[PDB]
């Protein structure tokens, strides 16, 4: 931006853990901030803006905010 310096991604569908603890849950159109300079085998690690929860999640469930 111009008065900010934090990378983000924006979600495009909801996500759930089902049978796990280390998985970050969310909805469509949510905002998540990155915690690693690269992904791990398709999994990203991030912190949600609304929930402030952390965990692994599928990078493909999100897109670069500024397309």
């Amino acid at each position: 931006g111009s008065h900010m310096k934090k990378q983000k991604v924006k979600t495009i569908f909801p996500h759930t853990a089902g049978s796990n603890k280390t998985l970050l849950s969310f909805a469509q159109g949510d905002v998540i901030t990155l915690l690693i300079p690269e992904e791990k085998d398709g999994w990203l690690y991030g912190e949600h803006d609304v929930s402030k929860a952390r965990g692994w999640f599928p990078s493909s469930y999100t897109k670069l905010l500024e397309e």
């Binding site: 569908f13 690693i36 085998d41 999994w43 690690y45 692994w56 999640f57 599928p58 493909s60 469930y61």
Partner: peptide, 17 residues
């Protein structure tokens, strides 16, 4: 410290128009 990754690859969104 970042927690360990799972033993399987990450899933994908639905394939739609």
């Amino acid at each position: 410290h970042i927690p360990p990754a799972p033993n399987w690859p990450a899933p994908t969104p639905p394939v739609q128009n």
